[PDB]
Symmetry: D2
Subunit: 226 residues, 4 copies
Amino acid sequence: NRHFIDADPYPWPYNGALRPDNTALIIIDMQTDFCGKGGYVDHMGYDLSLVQAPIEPIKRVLAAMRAKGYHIIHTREGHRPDLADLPANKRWRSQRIGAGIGDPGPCGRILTRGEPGWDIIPELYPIEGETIIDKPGKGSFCATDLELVLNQKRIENIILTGITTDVSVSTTMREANDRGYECLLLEDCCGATDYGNHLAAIKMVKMQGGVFGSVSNSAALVEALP
Amino acid sequence: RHFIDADPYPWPYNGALRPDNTALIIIDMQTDFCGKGGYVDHMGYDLSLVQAPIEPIKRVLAAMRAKGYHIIHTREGHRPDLADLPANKRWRSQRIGAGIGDPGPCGRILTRGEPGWDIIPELYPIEGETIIDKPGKGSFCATDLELVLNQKRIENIILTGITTDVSVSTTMREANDRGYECLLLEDCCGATDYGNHLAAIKMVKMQGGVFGSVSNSAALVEALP
Amino acid sequence: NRHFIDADPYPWPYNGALRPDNTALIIIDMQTDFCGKGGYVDHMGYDLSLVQAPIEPIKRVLAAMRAKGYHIIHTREGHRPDLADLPANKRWRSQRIGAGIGDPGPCGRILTRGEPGWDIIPELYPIEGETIIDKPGKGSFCATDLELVLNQKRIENIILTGITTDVSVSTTMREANDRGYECLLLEDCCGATDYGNHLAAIKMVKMQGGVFGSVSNSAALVEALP
Amino acid sequence: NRHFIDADPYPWPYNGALRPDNTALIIIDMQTDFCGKGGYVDHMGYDLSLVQAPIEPIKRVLAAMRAKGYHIIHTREGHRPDLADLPANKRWRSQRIGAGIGDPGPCGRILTRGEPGWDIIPELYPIEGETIIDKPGKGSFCATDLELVLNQKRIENIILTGITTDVSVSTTMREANDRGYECLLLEDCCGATDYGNHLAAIKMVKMQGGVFGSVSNSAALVEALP
Ligand SMILES: [Ca+2]
Ligand SMILES: [Ca+2]
Ligand SMILES: [Ca+2]
């Protein structure tokens, strides 16, 4: 009963065991803070078009995987309003460059849970029955219930999308891969603060016969999704 | 306070740099990753890229040993029974002719107890230095690294070893997510692809030091308290 | 600069480093589901007076530690409304005995986040600046951000209270102790579904020169708290 | 194609999905330090017959599960020779009662990796293909690769044996249960420093319709093992 997605450096998933019941899409940190005007990334002066580029491709993948009954997971990087989960170094770095986590901005308190800027963008909003992971780090496994959730659902395969490619997306992929999950990175469904770093994070997956998994794109996924 | 000249900010961020709260970690300087006959060699990558950091790590190691800093070493590898080896990881390595567990000139590839898997003689651990044996790229995943760091009350980590974009970068991300303050020494790491090495380094610097800061062996040795 | 609380089998904390900045009270799972009429524990037919007994002693410890600026942590065992974090075995066991997690009861859906029965009882309600851990298991470290929070605050010492003694309280103490935290169990500030199991969980702490930490009571803590 | 083991409070595993490929025996900390003369437990003056009693029953369960191709896991509590993984409180407690971890005794350095006293006893020694977990705490999940190993092998069911019942065995069971694993405690295959604490740890499993899993014995397991 095998099915593959055309991918680089190998057809994904490795063993062809691609089904709705054992496969999840994860949409990482598609929040106003990371891709919208007035947010954290905007405050740092990075080019929002790099991180907005993946919105429509993720939209297409999301629609297709919803229609076929695949597990859908969303993440939000953010902190408790009391900032108890905010490392001192992380906070200081963000303040030094004028984008202080917890400080007020046009979208509310930066990367603070419950604030408008922190929420997932309307274009990729979750619907009921889709798990949201609230995380205080870049990696989606660190200090969350993601592993527990994945194991209860018996998820083996993860399709990664979202932003930023080299930070949250890459870290989540590394975490997942280290724990035995089989991951596909959709290159047109991520974007970064630096386009070269985006391309490099993608190439890093491919080395050593697919060290972190494999790489494809939104069109190829939609085409071959069972 | 004490600082090391680093990019994008002088490290550590708060100047709290002492022997008692700072560790060097030497990641995966094993024959499998940088020596002839090992895993990386089997894949056809250029061993000089991964051998380049040996002498600079040696200098940092000697200095930090002399000043009583905590020293940690890692080894990526698997139990002889391969119970800790994900099926996908194994399959990928077999597909490209460098199968984990399969026999080669240095023994079974990335298998604990085999010659190829051990730390190279140049950077061998001495008594009192903790070795982390890990089944993944990240040094926190499925190990006691966090426990060890917390018992010693380590706040600052200086990262060296190979490969820059795989084990080193993953370990840095893990550490940083948990609140550790990390310095990557750019001349003390190397990768399978030199551009990926440079990119992993540049990734640290974004957003005012998203994963920590970056320096080099000479600058560290010169300013180490 | 050392301070100790009279405890068994050794004066706590072991090294006398007892300060507001490095010490937290944790109040475990003082929810209607575990000690109130109509909840999970009531449904199973256990004697609510055993689990209600610790309310006033915890109240006294809470008031004292708040007044002296100690870190205060609360926990709630519970599940996401979609039950993504609910193991199949856990759910099945609870249904078999007529107290099914997620099923409707007089206080709402049993052990389901957002429901009246699941919330912390009014007597021990959190105030702003006190961290609440929402956990899908008995142990407060499993699949939560508790460790991350404790480490950012540099907490070394934990004073444990709440219910039930042999389940969530004991599991949390074991987790904390394994990771190097120095724990004090307040015996009059916990209670269980079986009084002998309560006493036994307490005695287990004391073996081997304090294998899990040490044991005291609410009066002794209040009297000697710096 | 369901199979059950006669157990209390419910026939185990809960869903009858009992197979060699998804079930592991874990033999916890059957080391000279915990059950042999000259070791840690002996130094504390506890009665070695309590902790030796389970040896022959574990032997029978081990032989049967080996013969039927079940996954076999062993654990060893212990510390690196440099004691980097040894919490200061844990060490201090052990020194206070004259059984200091790392200190020299008749079996070598107490609970120190590489020492004779620390190794698994010859009667229950591992054979090739059987995973050994080296752990610095009582819980077998804390700071180890146990979860990773279990997930790669797709283990759902765990049969727990070893010592001590109320410390390492119970903590491991709680950890496993919190993460969704289905656990059976074999009551004649464990023993403790206090026989009443042993019985209490066992009874704790049974509350609330099997809060931590279920309880059986070596004979019942061997007789019904598929
Ligand atoms: Ca060499
Ligand atoms: Ca930290
Ligand atoms: Ca600690």
